[PDB]
Enzyme design. Structure first.
Site, PDB file in Angstrom:
ATOM      1  N   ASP A 144     -56.007  23.892 108.097  1.00 34.76           N
ATOM      2  CA  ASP A 144     -56.704  24.764 107.161  1.00 34.76           C
ATOM      3  C   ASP A 144     -55.991  26.117 107.036  1.00 34.76           C
ATOM      4  O   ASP A 144     -55.936  26.682 105.950  1.00 34.76           O
ATOM      5  CB  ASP A 144     -58.127  25.036 107.623  1.00 34.76           C
ATOM      6  CG  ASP A 144     -59.025  23.841 107.513  1.00 34.76           C
ATOM      7  OD1 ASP A 144     -58.812  22.957 106.646  1.00 34.76           O
ATOM      8  OD2 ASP A 144     -60.002  23.725 108.268  1.00 34.76           O
ATOM      9  N   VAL A 145     -55.507  26.651 108.155  1.00 31.87           N
ATOM     10  CA  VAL A 145     -54.751  27.891 108.126  1.00 31.87           C
ATOM     11  C   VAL A 145     -53.495  27.759 107.263  1.00 31.87           C
ATOM     12  O   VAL A 145     -53.213  28.652 106.485  1.00 31.87           O
ATOM     13  CB  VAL A 145     -54.426  28.400 109.506  1.00 31.87           C
ATOM     14  CG1 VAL A 145     -53.445  29.567 109.424  1.00 31.87           C
ATOM     15  CG2 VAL A 145     -55.704  28.844 110.179  1.00 31.87           C
TER      16      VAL A 145
ATOM     17  N   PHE B  73     -61.951  26.932 110.731  1.00 35.21           N
ATOM     18  CA  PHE B  73     -60.661  26.589 110.138  1.00 35.21           C
ATOM     19  C   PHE B  73     -59.786  26.055 111.246  1.00 35.21           C
ATOM     20  O   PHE B  73     -59.586  26.733 112.261  1.00 35.21           O
ATOM     21  CB  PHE B  73     -59.976  27.814 109.525  1.00 35.21           C
ATOM     22  CG  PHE B  73     -60.625  28.325 108.268  1.00 35.21           C
ATOM     23  CD1 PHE B  73     -61.853  29.001 108.320  1.00 35.21           C
ATOM     24  CD2 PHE B  73     -59.997  28.182 107.046  1.00 35.21           C
ATOM     25  CE1 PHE B  73     -62.448  29.488 107.148  1.00 35.21           C
ATOM     26  CE2 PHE B  73     -60.578  28.663 105.872  1.00 35.21           C
ATOM     27  CZ  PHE B  73     -61.799  29.312 105.915  1.00 35.21           C
ATOM     28  N   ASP B  74     -59.253  24.856 111.069  1.00 38.01           N
ATOM     29  CA  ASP B  74     -58.275  24.357 112.023  1.00 38.01           C
ATOM     30  C   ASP B  74     -56.857  24.734 111.577  1.00 38.01           C
ATOM     31  O   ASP B  74     -56.677  25.481 110.625  1.00 38.01           O
ATOM     32  CB  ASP B  74     -58.436  22.858 112.279  1.00 38.01           C
ATOM     33  CG  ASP B  74     -57.912  21.989 111.136  1.00 38.01           C
ATOM     34  OD1 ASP B  74     -57.510  22.510 110.082  1.00 38.01           O
ATOM     35  OD2 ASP B  74     -57.846  20.750 111.205  1.00 38.01           O
ATOM     36  N   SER B  75     -55.861  24.228 112.294  1.00 44.16           N
ATOM     37  CA  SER B  75     -54.483  24.654 112.112  1.00 44.16           C
ATOM     38  C   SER B  75     -53.993  24.277 110.721  1.00 44.16           C
ATOM     39  O   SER B  75     -53.235  25.032 110.111  1.00 44.16           O
ATOM     40  CB  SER B  75     -53.579  24.065 113.208  1.00 44.16           C
ATOM     41  OG  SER B  75     -53.632  22.635 113.206  1.00 44.16           O
TER      42      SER B  75
END
Length: 85
Positions: free
Chosen positions: A43-44, A39-41
């Site tokens: 996605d968070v 999860f990238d930023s």
């Protein structure tokens, strides 16, 4: 006593990742970083907004930016749910 609250929120995390985000996680440990789960930023942020809508919560931007581990999101959600009480 609201038993199994962490198990339930991990299960919700897995369901949302799978159903809304197309990510199959299967066996999540709370100690995993989101980064290691892929999860990238962004996605968070999407994940947080999905939890917000599901639980009628608001999570402040400052708190989102500090999220590293699954545990961190579970903890925030419990905290917001406890408050809204």
């Amino acid at each position: 006593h609201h038993h199994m609250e962490r198990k339930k929120l991990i299960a919700k995390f897995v369901e949302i990742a799978s159903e809304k985000m197309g990510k199959d996680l299967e066996t999540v440990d709370e100690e995993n970083t989101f980064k290691e789960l892929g999860f990238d930023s962004i996605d968070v942020i999407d994940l947080v907004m999905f939890f917000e809508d599901e639980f009628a919560l608001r999570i402040e931007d400052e708190e989102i930016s500090k999220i590293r581990k699954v545990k961190d999101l579970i903890d925030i959600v419990i905290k917001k749910l406890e408050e809204i009480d």
